[PDB]
Design a protein around this ligand. Sequence first.
Ligand SMILES: CC(=O)N[C@@H]1[C@@H](O)[C@H](O[C@@H]2O[C@H](CO)[C@@H](O[C@@H]3O[C@H](CO)[C@@H](O[C@@H]4O[C@H](CO)[C@@H](O[C@@H]5O[C@H](CO)[C@@H](O)[C@H](O)[C@H]5NC(C)=O)[C@H](O)[C@H]4NC(C)=O)[C@H](O)[C@H]3NC(C)=O)[C@H](O)[C@H]2NC(C)=O)[C@@H](CO)O[C@H]1O
Ligand code: MG
Ligand code: MG
Length: 435
Amino acid sequence: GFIDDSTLTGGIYYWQRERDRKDVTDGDKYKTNLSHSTWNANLDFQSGYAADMFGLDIAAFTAIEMAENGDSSHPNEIAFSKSNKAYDEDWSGDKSGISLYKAAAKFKYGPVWARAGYIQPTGQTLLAPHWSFMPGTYQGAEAGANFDYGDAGALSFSYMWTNEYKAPWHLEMDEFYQNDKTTKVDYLHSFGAKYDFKNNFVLEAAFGQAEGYIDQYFAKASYKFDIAGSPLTTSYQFYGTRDKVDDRSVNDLYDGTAWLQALTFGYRAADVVDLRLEGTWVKADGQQGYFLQRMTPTYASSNGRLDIWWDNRSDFNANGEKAVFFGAMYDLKNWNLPGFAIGASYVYAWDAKPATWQSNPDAYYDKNRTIEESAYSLDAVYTIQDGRAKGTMFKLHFTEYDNHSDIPSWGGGYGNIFQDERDVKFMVIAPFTIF
Ligand SMILES: CC(=O)N[C@@H]1[C@@H](O)[C@H](O[C@@H]2O[C@H](CO)[C@@H](O[C@@H]3O[C@H](CO)[C@@H](O[C@@H]4O[C@H](CO)[C@@H](O[C@@H]5O[C@H](CO)[C@@H](O)[C@H](O)[C@H]5NC(C)=O)[C@H](O)[C@H]4NC(C)=O)[C@H](O)[C@H]3NC(C)=O)[C@H](O)[C@H]2NC(C)=O)[C@@H](CO)O[C@H]1O
Ligand SMILES: [Mg+2]
Ligand SMILES: [Mg+2]
């Protein structure tokens, strides 16, 4: 029933960050890169289905700046950028505001479903929003279907079409453009599918396009099996992208197909420590020099599905780059501290190459150089177990990041690699239900 199955939920969020980065042009001074305290709050209405076919979802969030040092850079991605539209971004500030982030009619008819309006991708395609506390928002529609074949498996597939987007730090939607920020991309769309064989084997794949510009690929195979009574989870993931501009203009991003391949292992040992072993390998020949899982190249302009996230500041996505991640998350419940967990992680990556050509090379550009990067992070988490504030979570994250070069940040033909950093994030997440 439309009314009786309605839910209204939300949260209060607090984020405080101090990040400094090495300026190898000013004597390696670790300068303030981010320093701010910011609140978010959201309210999210989800209706039931009238006649099990017709529903509505509406949700909004606010960001309130609390503190920000004058030397912190922008946008910090928790407040709103001072620039309301992504393609106007000029990196000059941040501001408070209110954004409508869901506003959609939803539909169901047998095995088919659809949503249209201000939406997040929700099916099997490779479109994705950015996530801060809240998600970004697409203007468009998605429709898909679910077919259950009992023990023989289950098939799901969906299609999404969109012509505008806003990241959670943009108050307004913008259209899509090529790398020059002026040649129009009329839409993004994507089709994908998932087959679950109900034996812990699962296959997923999707294709997407940016109109006139980019073809995007995704595939993933996952498998779980028990060792010592606990599942070892494994997956192989492939992400691919090809452009349609190979004239060596500013819009020519990739030579051939660029891709990112990954293998992941996960295992919970002694029922108390979550372990992660992951590796990635990137090919990205051409002018850009790094792999992007999104189909529009401009920062904040759209996003795409990428199931690999190591929270170690760098993306480890340069041409040629190989990288290995080890993480451990230790639940302290047997010290009688249920809800307390501490963790640590480490990344080492090598063979990172630059763009294979540059139009205005800088002093440090050398087509055949290779470099290395590494990082380690520490994590502490507490979730309130009982009472008024049950589920309220406190998190503390520290990262030390090391560029194994003295190439200045964003330079040398490594357009997505920056210099040594120290990063500390403290966040509080306080969900609530009104009904
Ligand atoms: C609530 C919660 O817990 N949320 C997490 C969420 O944090 C996770 O998402 C991750 O969020 C962080 C944000 O904190 C993301 O970090 C982004 O990552 C970007 C790349 O992935 C990185 O992009 C670079 O940003 C630069 C500006 O800051 C760009 O520089 C500009 O380049 C222009 C190019 O010419 C130039 O003209 C400008 O002059 C230059 N800027 C200047 C001069 O100031 C640069 O181009 C850009 N690179 C790319 C490839 O776009 C961001 O800097 C970085 N920002 C931060 C941290 O502030 C991280 O990427 C997110 N995760 C991903 C990618 O997976 C989320 C993940 O699932 O989990 C949630 O739970
Ligand atoms: Mg972006
Ligand atoms: Mg260094």
